[PDB]
Design a protein around this ligand. Sequence first.
Ligand SMILES: CC(=O)N[C@@H]1[C@@H](O)[C@H](O)[C@@H](CO)O[C@H]1O
Ligand SMILES: CC(=O)N[C@@H]1[C@@H](O)[C@H](O)[C@@H](CO)O[C@H]1O
Ligand code: NA
Lengths: 426, 421
Amino acid sequence: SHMKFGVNYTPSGEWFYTWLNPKWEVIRRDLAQIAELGADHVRIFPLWTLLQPNRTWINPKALADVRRMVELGGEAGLDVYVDVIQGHLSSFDFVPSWLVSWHEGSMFTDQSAIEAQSALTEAIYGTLSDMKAFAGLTLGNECNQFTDATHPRRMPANAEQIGEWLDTLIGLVAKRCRRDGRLIAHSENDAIWYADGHAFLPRYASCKGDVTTVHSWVFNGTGQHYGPMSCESLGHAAWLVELSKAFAADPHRPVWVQAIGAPGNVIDSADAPEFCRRSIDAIADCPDVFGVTWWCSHRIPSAFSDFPFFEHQLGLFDVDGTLTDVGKAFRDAIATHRDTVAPPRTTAIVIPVDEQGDPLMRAAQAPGGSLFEAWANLNRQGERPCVITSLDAGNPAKLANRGIVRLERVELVAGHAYNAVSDPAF
Amino acid sequence: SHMKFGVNYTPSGEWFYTWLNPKWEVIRRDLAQIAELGADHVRIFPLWTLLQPNRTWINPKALADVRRMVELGGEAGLDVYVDVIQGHLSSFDFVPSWLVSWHEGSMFTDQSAIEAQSALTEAIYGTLSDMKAFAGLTLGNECNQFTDATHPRRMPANAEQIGEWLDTLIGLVAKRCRRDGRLIAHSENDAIWYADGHAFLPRYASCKGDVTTVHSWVFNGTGQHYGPMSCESLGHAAWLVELSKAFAADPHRPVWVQAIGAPGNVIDSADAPEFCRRSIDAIADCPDVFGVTWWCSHRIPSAFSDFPFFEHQLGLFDVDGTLTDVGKAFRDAIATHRDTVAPPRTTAIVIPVDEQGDPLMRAAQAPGGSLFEAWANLNRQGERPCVITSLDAGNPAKLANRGIVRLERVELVAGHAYNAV
Ligand SMILES: CC(=O)N[C@@H]1[C@@H](O)[C@H](O)[C@@H](CO)O[C@H]1O
Ligand SMILES: CC(=O)N[C@@H]1[C@@H](O)[C@H](O)[C@@H](CO)O[C@H]1O
Ligand code: NA
């Protein structure tokens, strides 16, 4: 099992505002730059407001521009994954006018909105279905943030409705994807792992869609509470990988670290290269990792305002296309880990779950929680821990299937370090 | 004093979603159709989300597309008025990501947002300043709806802050407009005239900017309470014209009926042509009317969803491009009233106001109110009433300046018909 290595593509010069009038020669250079790092894929992000400005009209020009960006990715030698619904990017919401204010509604429970997102998922897949470089689709970037209790314009949903939303949209394309050789996934931020009462449940990420996605951001309280270059912080992405597997029905389901960056609000810019290198060392020591997709390709121009300041500095390339120090670190990490194979992990911490396989207390596996710290401490001691649920602890078939020979039990104690946002202003 | 006649331009085929990828040959045909009616101007509506996707970046392609649309209006023989901030159109809000949810803010009070709207106003004027067909700008369509308490995502402001917002944005371009021969205006929905407690005040519409704008929509309770083809309904636009003048410092300031339609949620479709004709008859008998701008040019395609159903039928041309019966009525109204000059109105009903010139009770001038009905009843009787405030009533200079020789005082009685949506 060998990891893919890719980059989340932020267009240079105009960011995602480039979709209004893409500068195709710049986008061509951007993607060639990414390929020259040794990346094998990119993840790209069209805007929902431009794709679907009316509930029952999808803009053909927006679809054609997505196709053109995929085409240029292929011409650079990259596989291209497309996120369908943004939705949310870098602290900003892009919600079409037919779901705001006078037309406020929940994308998760309004049947007419669900039908619209279904039409959009089918239109994106159908537009791209003939492209050799089109590698797969994700429903959208961290869509669960819209339903969290923290959201200022929350779209309500209970957990059963979220399950139906995922099943509906994934089920539109899952059969096509498997027959065509493409991937279908969905993406939640870490509230799915950490926030008690959150309507997206851990098993949804680990059982629905073809691969589990995790987005690893140590500004979530981990870097603040333990230190930016602590083992808890450097190992955070590996923790999410191993945590997610506890909730998977498939004992070797791949886990995609679909976004990870070195955020300057907690990690000193001089440490970001080492953070990159050592975070990927830790990821590479987890079996069945689908790939690592760094956030992000290009710095945000300083002309653009209201981003959390660190978001500007996340790029592997600066605004002119020059490689940054983190870019150099990621390039070297790809070369280092192209054929790293991780050995099985055989000591498991046990997460108490209910009869449906859901955590009794997600706060216990959040930064500062008893389960979070049990894993981190076994990790620091060199024991390479994995994670199972209490239900599977009594299932020798799955245990033997994963090669687990030792169990570690701890009680639930909530952590209080978790940050649901990236910046104090939110 | 002669009226201009124009149309609010809704692009055929794709509505304002056309701004994503304008079909310029279709837009050229749209504007040629409008000119063939005998219209002399159009009002057009760029989208804020496309113009200013970041607080400190205005999209040059969006500016250039506005310029191209103005150019084609001129080539069709039309003057083009541009609304800067949409903002709000036909029940939908278009608010950039940097002012919503995690970035929620008030366009009326957040200084950084005010500076962004200032940059956008200057960029629109500067982009269009060399265009012969560019006739003027309005800050945006019914922007006050964002601060109304009825709005589900309200942008708060008190009346003093609204006044400063207007003064700030208008003052950016007012001198340039006067020097270049163009107009600067702002636009509120009728909450400014009717909604007690609303932070936009009547005198703002009648004193700030170069001309008063009124948008006349009888689904506001007038048609429901009196009947869609009652004199109260047919005269509602003329009423807004004459009511607005009471709060104007300038005794001959022009009043622009900048939007008026025959909404099918209260007016039977078979009656809409007569509603058009007779509403304009009443408007044409008010002096100092800048113009009448019908809502709207082209019907919204039935493929588009979530509009109030009546919005689909407001266009003068059908989805196939054929002239509707209301379009024929508007075309004939232009021919009828191109050279109508309204004589002075000399009998005034008096609006009690406080020392700042604000109504003591806006509900009394709202549908169902005593002042609203006193005007409609005098107009129905052929008395051609105008409107002054109680402050005016003890100012012989202004009274003489407007030619007012008779006053009618009426006791305040609140109306209850007003619909804010
Ligand atoms: C409002 C806010 O800051 N949201 C951020 C989001 O932009 C980011 O993608 C995510 C990563 O986990 O973390 C959230 O807290
Ligand atoms: C939410 C809603 O219906 N808003 C409408 C607005 O679209 C219309 O332009 C205006 C005309 O006066 O009346 C408001 O009530
Ligand atoms: Na529960």
